[PDB]
Amino acid sequence: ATKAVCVLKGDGPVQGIINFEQKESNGPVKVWGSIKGLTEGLHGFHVHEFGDNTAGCTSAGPHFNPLSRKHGGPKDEERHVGDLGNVTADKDGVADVSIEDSVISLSGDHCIIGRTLVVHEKADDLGKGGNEESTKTGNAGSRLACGVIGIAQ
Amino acid sequence: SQVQLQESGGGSVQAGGSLRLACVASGGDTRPYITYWMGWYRQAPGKEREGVATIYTGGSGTYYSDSVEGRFTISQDKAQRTVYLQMNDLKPEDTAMYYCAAGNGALPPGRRLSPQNMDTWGPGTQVTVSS
Ligand SMILES: [Zn+2]
Numbered sequence: 001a002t003k004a005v006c007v008l009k010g011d012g013p014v015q016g017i018i019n020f021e022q023k024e025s026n027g028p029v030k031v032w033g034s035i036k037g038l039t040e041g042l043h044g045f046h047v048h049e050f051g052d053n054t055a056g057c058t059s060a061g062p063h064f065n066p067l068s069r070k071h072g073g074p075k076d077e078e079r080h081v082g083d084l085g086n087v088t089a090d091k092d093g094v095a096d097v098s099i100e101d102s103v104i105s106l107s108g109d110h111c112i113i114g115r116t117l118v119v120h121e122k123a124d125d126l127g128k129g130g131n132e133e134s135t136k137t138g139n140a141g142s143r144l145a146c147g148v149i150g151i152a153q
Numbered sequence: 154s155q156v157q158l159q160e161s162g163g164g165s166v167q168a169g170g171s172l173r174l175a176c177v178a179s180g181g182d183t184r185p186y187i188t189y190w191m192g193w194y195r196q197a198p199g200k201e202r203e204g205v206a207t208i209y210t211g212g213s214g215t216y217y218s219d220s221v222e223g224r225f226t227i228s229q230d231k232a233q234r235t236v237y238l239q240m241n242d243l244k245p246e247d248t249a250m251y252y253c254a255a256g257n258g259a260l261p262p263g264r265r266l267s268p269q270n271m272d273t274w275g276p277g278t279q280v281t282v283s284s
Contacts, residue, residue, distance in 0.1 A: 013188055013258040037188055037259030040212030092214035093188055093258055121186050144186060 002106040005152035006117045010057060010145035013037035018097060018117060019152065022106040029106060031084070031099040035119055035145070038089035044120030044140025045097070047082030047104065047149070051114045057143035060116035062136070066109060070135045073126035074101055081110050083138075086124050095119075118146040156181030156189075156273045160253050163278035170282075171241040176253040176275060178234045186211075188258030190265045193227065193238045196277075197249040202268035205251075206238055211258055216265055245284040252277035 001023045008016035016035030022028070048060035063071065064082030072079035081103050089095040104112050121141030129139045160176040174193065181187075192207035206217045206227040215227055226239040236253065256264075256271045264270045 012184075012186055014186070015259050036261070037257070038211065039186060039188065040209075089212070090214075091212040092209055092262075093211045142186075 003152045004106055004113050004149050006147040006149045008035060008117065008119055008145035008147045010143070012144060014119065014145040016095070016097075016119065016145060018147075020106060020112075020149065025107055026105060028100050028102045029104050031097060031101065033097050035087065035089070035095040035097065036093060038093045038095055038119070038144070040089050040091055040093060042086040042088060042123035043095065043144070044118075044122065044124040044138060045084045045087045045099075046080075046118055046120070046124075046140070047084065047112050048116045048118055048146075049082075051116050051148040053116070053146065053148070057116070057118055057146035060118060060143070060146055064112065064115055071127045071138050073124075074099075074103075076126070078127070079103070082112070082115075083124075085126070087119065113149050113151060115149055116146050117149055118143050120144055154180060156255055158253055158255065158273060158275035160251070160275045160278050163251055163280040165281050165283065166243055168243060168245060168282055168284045170243055171239065172243065172280060174238040174240055174251055174253075174278070174280065176236050176238075178255065189255040190258055190260050191229070191236045191253065191255050192266055192271070193236070193251060193253050194268055194271075195247075195249045195251055197246075200249075202252075203249070204266040204268060207265050208236060209258065210234075216262075218266060240280065243282045245282050248281045249279070250277045251280045 004020040014037035018033035052059040124138035188211035195203035
């Protein structure tokens with residue numbers, strides 16, 4: 001039963017804390033937590049390749065893509081491993097994240113600890129935007145906040 | 154460079170009347186994802202800073218104090234970056250210098266209408282009521 005945590009911080013008001021739990025190895029991962037400071041609506045929520053922030057969230061790299069696939073949605077088969085879809089910030093800018101994903105893992109080759117979790121500016125179009133940016137970043141906009149996913153107690 | 158606030162619309166009024174308190178923000182961080190919790194406040198003669206209402210510039214959340222009820226109504230035009238604090242059904246203990254202010258958009262609940270967690274303040278206009 002592995003557990004992980006990640007603290008989203010950026011150069012803007014957006015700040016959050018997200019927890020990950022995998023009670024069984026190679027099984028579904030529960031991702032729950034809270035983000036604040038967001039604009040009301042949908043926001044991109046992804047896991048990028050590198051846990052690197054020497055130059056901020058931009059140092060995280062692209063969406064964690066170990067299988068060299070196109071960008072899609074959490075339920076799509078054509079997706080990056082880090083494609084977790086969108087989170088919803090309510091009228092108070094609080095996103096109470098609750099997600100369950102079975103492609104990301106806390107171990108193995110799809111393992112995401114030591115990688116960066118990022119919440120974005122715009123909304124992920126799930127790879128259906130009709131441009132080359134849609135099949136890569138989902139037109140989710142700039143990187144609002146990010147954090148290294150580390151082992152938690 | 155600094156988020157300057159400027160209030161207006163305040164003055165003298167009688168008990169049981171309306172008085173619009175509008176404040177236009179200027180300067181600072183004008184990127185669209187910057188969010189504040191814009192709150193109107195109250196320094197009564199001899200008291201400390203109170204706090205009447207607050208709104209979110211990144212959504213539509215409105216939080217009020219208990220001293221006020223269905224008497225005030227706070228709204229916003231985001232394009233004009235202006236917050237409107239309607240003030241109808243006024244009583245004589247509302248006499249105070251009403252300032253508006255802006256705090257962090259991720260300010261947790263409760264601390265939203267706290268004057269200590271507030272960043273920048275406005276000059277202020279006095280809203281006196283007569284009975
Ligand atoms: Zn992706």
